[PDB]
Design an enzyme around this catalytic site. Structure first.
Site, short mmCIF file in Angstrom:
data_model
loop_
_atom_site.label_atom_id
_atom_site.label_comp_id
_atom_site.label_asym_id
_atom_site.label_seq_id
_atom_site.Cartn_x
_atom_site.Cartn_y
_atom_site.Cartn_z
N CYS A 93 0.78 -1.24 0.00
CA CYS A 93 0.00 0.00 0.00
C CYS A 93 0.82 1.31 0.00
O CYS A 93 0.59 2.18 -0.85
CB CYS A 93 -1.02 -0.01 1.14
SG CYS A 93 -1.10 -1.58 2.05
N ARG A 122 6.33 -11.10 6.17
CA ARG A 122 5.97 -10.83 7.54
C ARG A 122 6.66 -11.88 8.39
O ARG A 122 6.72 -13.04 8.00
CB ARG A 122 4.45 -10.91 7.70
CG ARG A 122 3.73 -9.89 6.83
CD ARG A 122 2.23 -10.11 6.74
NE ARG A 122 1.63 -9.12 5.85
CZ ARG A 122 0.34 -9.05 5.56
NH1 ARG A 122 -0.51 -9.92 6.09
NH2 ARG A 122 -0.11 -8.11 4.74
N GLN A 140 0.58 -11.35 -2.73
CA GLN A 140 -0.81 -10.90 -2.66
C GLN A 140 -1.30 -10.47 -4.03
O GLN A 140 -0.55 -9.88 -4.80
CB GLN A 140 -0.93 -9.71 -1.70
CG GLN A 140 -1.62 -10.00 -0.38
CD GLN A 140 -1.65 -8.78 0.53
OE1 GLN A 140 -0.98 -7.78 0.28
NE2 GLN A 140 -2.44 -8.86 1.61
N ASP A 142 -3.06 -7.65 -5.07
CA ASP A 142 -3.33 -6.51 -4.22
C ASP A 142 -3.60 -5.29 -5.06
O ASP A 142 -2.79 -4.93 -5.91
CB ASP A 142 -2.16 -6.25 -3.28
CG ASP A 142 -2.50 -5.29 -2.16
OD1 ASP A 142 -3.69 -5.25 -1.75
OD2 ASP A 142 -1.60 -4.58 -1.69
N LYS A 224 -15.10 -2.44 6.55
CA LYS A 224 -14.65 -3.40 5.55
C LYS A 224 -15.66 -4.48 5.18
O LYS A 224 -16.63 -4.72 5.90
CB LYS A 224 -13.33 -4.06 5.99
CG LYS A 224 -13.46 -4.91 7.25
CD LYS A 224 -12.16 -5.65 7.54
CE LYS A 224 -12.24 -6.37 8.88
NZ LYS A 224 -10.98 -7.11 9.19
N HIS A 270 -8.39 -0.67 -0.18
CA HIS A 270 -7.61 -1.89 -0.31
C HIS A 270 -8.54 -2.97 -0.82
O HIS A 270 -9.59 -3.19 -0.23
CB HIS A 270 -7.06 -2.33 1.05
CG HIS A 270 -6.24 -1.29 1.74
ND1 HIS A 270 -4.86 -1.32 1.75
CD2 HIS A 270 -6.60 -0.20 2.46
CE1 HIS A 270 -4.40 -0.29 2.44
NE2 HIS A 270 -5.44 0.41 2.88
C1 LIG Z 1 -0.13 -0.13 10.11
C2 LIG Z 1 -1.54 -0.69 10.24
C3 LIG Z 1 -1.50 -2.17 10.59
C4 LIG Z 1 -2.87 -2.74 10.95
C5 LIG Z 1 -3.42 -2.10 12.23
C6 LIG Z 1 -2.77 -4.25 11.09
C7 LIG Z 1 -4.10 -4.95 11.38
C8 LIG Z 1 -3.85 -6.36 11.90
C9 LIG Z 1 -5.03 -4.99 10.17
O1 LIG Z 1 -5.73 -3.75 10.07
C10 LIG Z 1 -4.27 -5.30 8.88
C11 LIG Z 1 -5.18 -5.24 7.68
O2 LIG Z 1 -6.36 -5.55 7.77
O3 LIG Z 1 -4.65 -4.82 6.38
C12 LIG Z 1 -5.54 -5.02 5.28
C13 LIG Z 1 -4.97 -6.05 4.32
C14 LIG Z 1 -5.75 -6.10 3.01
C15 LIG Z 1 -5.66 -7.55 2.53
C16 LIG Z 1 -5.45 -8.39 3.79
C17 LIG Z 1 -4.92 -7.46 4.87
C18 LIG Z 1 -3.50 -7.79 5.17
O4 LIG Z 1 -2.62 -7.39 4.38
O5 LIG Z 1 -3.24 -8.46 6.20
C19 LIG Z 1 -5.71 -3.72 4.50
C20 LIG Z 1 -5.36 -2.52 5.34
C21 LIG Z 1 -4.17 -1.92 5.30
C22 LIG Z 1 -4.08 -0.78 6.20
C23 LIG Z 1 -3.13 0.18 6.28
C24 LIG Z 1 -2.08 0.20 5.58
N1 LIG Z 1 -1.18 0.21 4.84
C25 LIG Z 1 -3.34 1.21 7.33
O6 LIG Z 1 -3.05 2.50 6.78
C26 LIG Z 1 -2.49 0.99 8.59
C27 LIG Z 1 -3.13 1.74 9.75
C28 LIG Z 1 -2.32 -0.48 8.95
ZN LIG Z 2 -3.15 -2.05 1.03
#
Ligand SMILES: C[C@@H]1C[C@H](C)C[C@H](C)[C@@H](O)CC(=O)O[C@H]([C@@H]2CCC[C@H]2C(=O)O)C/C=C/C=C(\C#N)[C@H](O)[C@@H](C)C1
Ligand SMILES: [Zn+2]
Ligand SMILES: C[C@@H]1C[C@H](C)C[C@H](C)[C@@H](O)CC(=O)O[C@H]([C@@H]2CCC[C@H]2C(=O)O)C/C=C/C=C(\C#N)[C@H](O)[C@@H](C)C1
Ligand SMILES: [Zn+2]
Lengths: 401, 401
Positions: A93, A122, A140, A142, A224, A270
Site C-alpha cells: 500500500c 511478515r 498478494q 493486491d 470493511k 484496499h
Molecule cells: C499499520 C496498520 C497495521 C494494521 C493495524 C494491522 C491490522 C492487523 C489490520 O488492520 C491489517 C489489515 O487488515 O490490512 C488489510 C490487508 C488487506 C488484505 C489483507 C490485509 C493484510 O494485508 O493483512 C488492508 C489494510 C491496510 C491498512 C493500512 C495500511 N497500509 C493502514 O493505513 C495501517 C493503519 C495499517
Molecule cells: Zn493495502
C-alpha cells in the site's frame, strides 16, 4: 486432500529449515502460479487496473509514517545500509501511494485503480507456519483504488463483481460475506463512516448478497467487507476483502485537485480477491485433490511412444501441440507403456496421448485421460481444437465430463 | 539520451531516498518490464528451460557454505528472526541447487536447465548508485545448467545462440565475446579446466565468433565467456555471461547417479543474457532514445477524435483494438487535433489513429506515427492485422518502410 503431500507427489514445491515459511517453487507449481498471474491480469485488463511494481524494502521513517512501526513492528524484517534502517515490505500500500504522489493528480484521474502482485514478508512465529497457507513470504493479489466520496459505491460494486467472477471461475459458488463497521474510537468523521458503511451495505444489497454485520469489528482506519469461500468439503476459507482506509492517504500526503480547483484528499480502498496466492494454491490443490483443471495443469498433455519406431512421430506431434500453446511433454524413455501411463496418471496429467504404429500410419493419436477414460483414436487437429477451447474457457471439466 | 530524463518524461518509473537503488515501476515502465519478461519466457520455452521461483532470504549458514559470507559479506543485506540470521539473496544460484537437490537425479535427468527471474539485493554504496543501471534491488534473467562434462560444449553452444538471438531481437548485432581463463590458483583439476576452456573456445569458433582471450582473469571456481553489446552510439555494455562453476555443486552437495551406476557431481553453468533487466531497460531506453519498438511500447495506439461526433466511433475502435490484444488509449478531450498528436508524439506513442466524420462514414482511420509520418486513410481491420504482425514479430521498425 493434503496440499503438502500432493505438493510433493506432483513436484510442485518444497520447503527447508534454512528458509522457514518461504516457498521454493519448482517448475510445475510455478507454472500453476504463473497461470494464476495470467488469469488475474486478464481480470485487471477487464476491470481496468494499472499494474505496478514497488520496491522490496523502504526505510524506517516511511513505515513510521504509515503506522506500521507502532502496530506491525514484530511482524517486519529489518535490515540496514549505511547507518539507515529499512523494513522489508509487509504490505504494498505505501509504495502504491508513493507512486500516486508522483505527478499532479486531478479529479479527472479518479478513479485510479493500481494493482500489483505484492511480494510481502511478515515475520510469523515459526510454530504457526503451515504449508502454503501460513508462510513468511507470500504474493498478494493486491489493488488500491483512489477515488472520491461519490465514486465509493460503484468501485465497491466493481470489487464485488470481480470477487464473484474470479471465485466462480475456480468453481466456488458458496460465499459468505461479512460487513465490519465502526469501533468505539476511529479515524474519520461520523459522516464519512456513515457514507462508507451505507455504500458497502447498499452495494451488497444491490448485488443481491445476503451478509452479516460484525459490529465494532472494523479497523480504526475504516469499515470493511470480507469474503469467505467454501470448498468441496464445505470448509471455510477467508480470502477476499474490500477495506476502506481513511488513515493512509493523509499520513502519506496524497491529494488531488477537485472540480472546484480545491485540494482534496482521495478515498482509499484496499482490495484483494485471492489474498495470498501461495495459500490460494494450497486451497486449490486440496479442493481439486491434485487434479487441476487443464488450464491450471502444470503439464497438460503427455505423448508416449510404444517403441522407438514411434519416437520421430511423437516428437513431431510434441512440436505441433507445443506451437498450439499447449503444455506438452514427450516420454521417449525406454520403458513399457504401462509404466509411463501409471507415472503420468499419478502426476494427474489431464491428457495422455499414445502413439503406436496404428497412429503413425493413420496420422492420429490414441487419447486417454487421468480418470481412466479412453477417448480413442482422434485427429490431431481435433485434439488441439478441443484442448485449446478447454484452456481458453478455463473449464473445470475435461472432454466427456 | 538519458534513461532517467526519458523515464521521467514517459512516466516509466521513479526513485526515492527512502528506497535508494530501488525502483518504483509505474504502469508504463512495468508494461515494458512485462514485455521483456514475456519475450524471455518465449526464449525459455524455445531453448527448453524450466522456470522456478526461489525464496527471498535464507539462513546465514547457507551463504557460509556457498562462500558468500567470506567473499560477498559487505554486499549482502542481513535480517533476523527468532535468534537466527538470514541474508537476502544477492544471487539465485544456491536456491536453484536446493531445488535440484530435491529428489534423486540421474544422468537421464541431464542436462537440466533451470531459469528464474531473480530478485536480487546487493548493498551498493549509495554514491555509486546511478539510475536503473547501478541499483540495490534488481531482477536478473538467470539460469543454471546442470550437466555432464560431455554436454558442456552443446550447452555453451545453446547459450551462445540464445545470446545472439536475444541481442539481435533488440537490434544489437555488434558483439564482442571475451573468454576468461584459469587464474594461478583455482578450484578444479587442470584436466577439468582444459576441457571446459576448450569447450568454450570450440563452441565459440563453431559459432564463427572471433573471441578475445583474457588470460588468468577467470574466477577461481571456473572459466567464463562474457558478451558485450555495442549500441547506436557505439558504447559498450557487458551484459551476458556463461560461467562454469566447480565450487557450488560440491559445496551444496549436488549429485546424480551416473550411467555406470556411480555417484557423479553435476557440472554447473551460470548463464545470463540481459543481466539486470532494469539496467537493460535503461540501455534500451537510451538506445531507442525513448522510441520503443511497438511490442515494447507502453501505449501502442492512441485513437483520437476531432469533435464529439466521432467519440462513439472512437470508443468502438478502442474496444476493438483492446480486444485484438493491442494496448490502446482513447483521447476524447476537447483540444485541437494537432495538440493531441504533438502530445502523444512527445509520449512516443507509435501510432495515432485520427477519426473525423469521413473516417466514421467510411469505417476507416487516418493513421499517423510518432516519427511524423502520415500513413493516410486505412481500413481498420487492415491496421489491426499489420499491428498484430508488427507486435508478434517484435519488429524494430514501424509501418511504411
Ligand atoms: C499499520 C496498520 C497495521 C494494521 C493495524 C494491522 C491490522 C492487523 C489490520 O488492520 C491489517 C489489515 O487488515 O490490512 C488489510 C490487508 C488487506 C488484505 C489483507 C490485509 C493484510 O494485508 O493483512 C488492508 C489494510 C491496510 C491498512 C493500512 C495500511 N497500509 C493502514 O493505513 C495501517 C493503519 C495499517
Ligand atoms: Zn493495502
Ligand atoms: C561467493 C562467491 C562470490 C564471488 C567471489 C564474487 C565475484 C566478484 C564474482 O565471481 C561474482 C560472479 O561472477 O557471479 C556470477 C554472476 C553471473 C551473472 C553476473 C555475476 C553476478 O551475479 O554479479 C555467477 C557466479 C556465481 C558463483 C558462485 C555462486 N553462487 C560461486 O559458487 C561463489 C564462489 C561466488
Ligand atoms: Zn548463479
Amino acid at each position: 486432500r493434503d496440499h503438502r503431500k500432493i505438493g510433493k507427489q506432483l513436484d510442485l514445491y518444497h520447503m527447508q529449515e534454512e528458509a522457514p515459511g518461504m516457498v521454493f517453487w519448482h517448475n510445475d507449481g510455478w507454472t500453476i502460479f504463473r497461470e494464476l498471474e495470467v488469469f488475474v491480469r486478464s481480470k485487471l485488463k477487464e476491470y481496468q487496473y494499472q499494474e505496478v511494481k514497488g520496491p522490496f524494502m523502504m526505510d524506517r521513517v516511511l513505515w513510521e509514517k504509515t503506522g506500521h512501526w507502532d502496530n506491525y513492528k514484530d511482524a517486519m524484517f529489518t535490515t540496514s545500509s549505511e547507518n539507515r534502517e529499512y523494513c522489508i515490505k509487509p504490505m504494498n500500500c505505501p509504495g502504491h501511494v508513493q507512486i500516486f504522489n508522483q505527478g499532479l493528480k486531478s479529479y479527472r484521474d479518479l478513479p485510479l485503480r493500481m494493482a500489483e502482485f505484492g511480494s510481502c514478508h511478515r515475520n510469523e512465529p515459526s510454530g504457526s507456519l503451515h504449508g502454503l497457507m501460513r508462510v513468511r513470504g507470500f504474493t498478494q493479489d493486491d489493488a488500491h483504488i483512489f477515488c472520491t466520496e461519490e465514486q465509493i459505491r460503484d468501485e465497491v460494486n466493481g470489487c464485488i463483481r470481480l470477487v464473484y467472477d474470479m471465485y466462480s471461475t475456480f468453481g466456488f459458488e458458496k460465499i459468505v460475506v461479512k460487513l465490519s463497521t465502526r469501533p468505539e474510537k476511529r479515524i474519520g468523521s461520523d459522516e464519512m463512516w456513515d457514507r462508507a458503511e451505507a455504500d458497502l451495505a447498499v452495494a451488497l444489497e444491490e448485488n443481491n448478497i445476503p451478509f452479516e454485520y460484525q459490529l465494532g469489528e472494523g479497523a480504526f482506519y475504516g469499515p470493511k467487507i470480507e469474503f469467505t469461500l467454501y470448498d468441496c468439503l464445505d470448509r471455510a476459507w477467508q480470502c477476499g476483502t474490500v477495506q476502506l482506509d481513511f488513515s493512509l492517504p493523509s499520513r502519506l500526503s496524497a491529494s488531488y485537485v477537485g472540480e472546484d480547483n480545491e485540494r482534496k484528499v482521495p478515498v482509499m480502498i484496499h482490495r484483494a480477491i485471492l489474498g495470498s496466492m501461495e495459500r490460494f494454491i494450497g486451497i486449490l490443490t486440496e479442493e481439486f485433490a491434485g487434479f487441476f483443471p487443464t488450464w491450471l495443469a502444470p503439464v497438460q498433455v503427455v505423448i508416449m511412444n510404444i517403441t522407438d519406431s514411434q519416437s520421430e512421430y511423437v516428437n513431431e506431434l510434441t512440436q505441433k501441440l507445443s506451437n498450439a500453446g499447449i503444455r506438452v511433454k514427450a516420454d521417449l524413455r525406454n520403458e513399457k507403456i504401462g509404466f509411463k501411463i501409471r507415472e503420468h496418471t499419478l502426476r494427474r496429467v489431464p491428457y495422455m496421448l499414445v502413439c503406436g504404429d496404428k497412429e503413425v500410419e493413420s496420422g492420429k493419436v490414441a487419447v486417454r485421460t487421468r480418470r481412466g477414460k479412453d477417448l480413442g483414436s482422434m485427429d490431431v487437429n481435433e485434439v488441439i481444437e478441443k484442448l485449446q477451447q478447454e484452456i481458453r474457457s478455463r473449464s473445470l471439466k475435461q472432454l466427456e465430463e
